[PDB]
C-alpha cells in the first residue's frame with residue numbers, strides 16, 4: 181500500500197498524523213436529519229445554545245486529553261459542516277468530517293445507483309462538503325440486520341470511494357445480529373482491505389467469537405458505545421431500547437478481552453456521544469446526559485483508568501487511543 | 517370568517533390579493549429532498565444551471581399571463597427558499613412558499629408529536645423558513661392511500677396551523693383510491709372549514725362521483741396534473757407509473773365536467789411541473805420535458821384555449837385562474 185500525502189482532512193483543513201494525538205473515532209456533534217437543524221433550530225433550544233453546549237463539552241474532553249474526534253455524521257444524520265468548523269475552532273479540538281449514508285436516506289438518495297452514490301462520496305471527499313471546501317476524512321455506512329438492497333449499494337460505493345481516495349470506512353451495525361460479517365463480505369467483494377474498515381458498535385454484543393473472528397481477518401473493531409447503559413432506567417422503554425441493559429464496565433471489558441486475544445492494534449474506542457439528538461424520542465438527550473455527565477470525556481476519565489486498574493498496560497492504552505486512530509485515518513491507498 | 521390583513525406572503529414579501537393575478541396553485545421549482553440541492557448540486561448539472569432553467573421557464577409562463585405560482589414544495593421535498601426568492605426576482609413572478617410535510621419525512625420529523633409538528637408549521641408561517649424571514653403562504657400535506665399514523669398527525673397539525681393563521685391547506689392524494697374522503701374526515705374533526713382545503717391530484721381519477729361529492733361539501737378540487745401523460749412511452753415503466761396513460765384532454769375535460777355540475781368556484785388548476793426532479797428515477801426530468809415542452813405555460817397555452825373551444829366561457833376561465841386562487845390563498849380565520 182501507499183499513501184496520498186500523509187495528512188488527515190479536518191474541518192479546519194489538513195493536519196499531520198502526529199497532530200491528531202488522542203482520537204475519539206466515533207462521535208457526533210449533533211444526531212439529526214438533513215436540513216433539520218437549519219429549519220427547526222428551536223428544537224435544540226437554538227443553534228447558539230447547541231454550539232455552546234458542544235464547545236463546553238469538547239473543552240472538557242480536551243482538558244482530559246482528547247485532541248481529535250471523528251464526527252461520523254453523514255448527510256442523512258444532518259451533518260452541518262459549518263457547525264463543526266465553528267465548534268472545532270472555538271474548542272480547539274480537531275474534528276474529522278464524514279461522507280457516506282446512515283439508515284435514514286431520503287428518496288433523492290435511495291433511488292440512486294451505485295455509480296451515482298460513488299460520485300457523491302468522492303465529491304465530499306475530494307471537492308468538499310456543500311460549498312465549504314471542507315473535505316471528508318472518513319466514509320460512514322450502516323445496516324440494521326441483513327443489508328437491504330439499497331444498503332448493499334451504499335457499502336459498495338463506500339468501498340469504491342475508499343479504494344480511490346485512501347480514506348477509511350467505518351460502520352454502524354446491529355452487533356447482536358453479527359452484521360459485521362455481511363459488511364465484510366461485501367467490502368472484500370470490492371477488493372477493499374479490512375485494515376481500511378472499522379466495524380462499529382461492536383461493544384453492543386458480548387459474543388467474543390464474533391469479534392475475534394473479525395479481528396483475525398484484519399478488521400478494526402469499534403468499541404464505541406462504552407457509556408451506553410439504561411440500567412436503572414428499566415422503566416424507560418425508549419431509552420432501554422437504544423442504550424441496552426449492559427453496564428459500561430461490561431462493554432469496557434471487551435476491550436481488555438480483545439487485548440488478551442492479541443488484537444490491541446485493531447481496537448478503536450469511543451463514546452458515540454452527541455450534544456443534540458433529534459432523530460429519536462424527545463428529551464432523549466436529557467436522559468443520556470444524566471446517564472453519562474462526562475459526555476465525550478467518559479473514555480479518558482473513566483474507561484482508561486478502569487482498564488489500567490484491571491491489568492492493562494498504560495502503554496497499550498496509548499497505542500489504542502493514539503496509534504490505532506492515526507494509522508486508521510491516514511489516507512492509505514492499496515498496493516497497485 | 518375573518519381576514520388577517522388581506523395579504524398573501526410570497527418569497528419576496530407580502531402582496532395584495534389583486535397583485536396575485538393569474539395563479540398556478542400547485543407547482544414546484546425543484547422536486548428533491550431536504551439538504552439535497554446544497555450537498556449534491558451537480559445532480560442537476562449545477563445550482564446555476566437549475567436556476568437559469570427555472571428562470572427561463574417562469575418567464576415563459578409569465579409571457580403567457582402567469583403572474584403567480586404556488587410552490588408546494590415542503591421541507592422534505594427539498595424546498596430551498598433561497599432558490600425560490602432568487603428565481604422569483606429574476607423572472608419577476610410571485611412565488612408563494614409552503615410549509616407542511618410530504619411523504620418522505622426523515623426521522624427527526626417522523627418521531628414528532630402533533631403538538632411539535634404544529635409548532636414547526638407555525639414557525640414557518642409566522643416566523644419564517646429557516647432564518648430568511650420568508651413566511652409560508654400555504655400548508656402542504658399528503659397520503660398515498662389510507663393515512664399512516666404519522667400522516668394522521670400531520671393532517672391534524674396542518675389543520676391546527678391553518679385555524680390559527682388563516683393559511684390554506686393543500687394536499688397530495690392517490691385520487692384513484694379516494695384519499696380525499698379520509699383527508700376531509702380528519703380535517704373536519706379538527707374544525708377546519710372545507711373552504712380552506714384543496715384536495716389535489718384529483719384529475720388522476722375518472723370518478724366524477726368522488727369529486728362532486730367533495731365539491732358539494734365545500735372543498736376545492738385541485739385538477740393540477742393536466743399535462744401528465746405517458747402515452748407514447750408505454751415501454752417506460754417508471755414514466756408510466758407516475759404520468760399515467762390518460763391523455764391531457766381527458767384530465768382537462770374534468771374541469772369542464774365540474775363546471776357543468778355547477779362547481780366552477782371550487783376548481784383550481786395547475787401543472788404540477790418542476791425544473792429539477794431528484795426524488796425519482798434519474799433523467800425523469802428529461803422525459804417529462806419531452807412530454808410537455810411548455811412546462812408551466814401548458815395551462816394558459818393549451819388548456820385554457822381547449823376548454824374555451826369546448827364551450828367554456830372565457831369569464832368562467834378567468835374566475836378559475838384568478839378569482840378562485842385569490843379567494844383560496846387570502847389568509848382567512850374562522851368567524852369568532
Ligand SMILES: CCOP(=O)(Cc1ccc(C)cc1)OCC
Pocket residue numbers: 201202244245246480484497498501502
Ligand atoms: C503517551 C503520552 O500520552 P499523551 O500523548 C496523550 C494521552 C493523554 C491522555 C490519555 C488518557 C491517553 C493519551 O499525553 C497528552 C499530552
Ligand SMILES: CCOP(=O)(Cc1ccc(C)cc1)OCC
Pocket residue numbers: 537538580581582816820833834837838
Ligand atoms: C380578466 C382576466 O385577464 P387577465 O387579468 C389575467 C389572465 C391572463 C391570461 C389568461 C389566459 C387568463 C387570465 O389579463 C392579463 C392582463
Ligand SMILES: [Co+2]
Pocket residue numbers: 352353381
Ligand atoms: Co450508529
Ligand SMILES: [Co+2]
Pocket residue numbers: 206207208252452
Ligand atoms: Co454514531
Ligand SMILES: [Co+2]
Pocket residue numbers: 688689717
Ligand atoms: Co403530489
Ligand SMILES: [Co+2]
Pocket residue numbers: 542543544588788
Ligand atoms: Co406536486
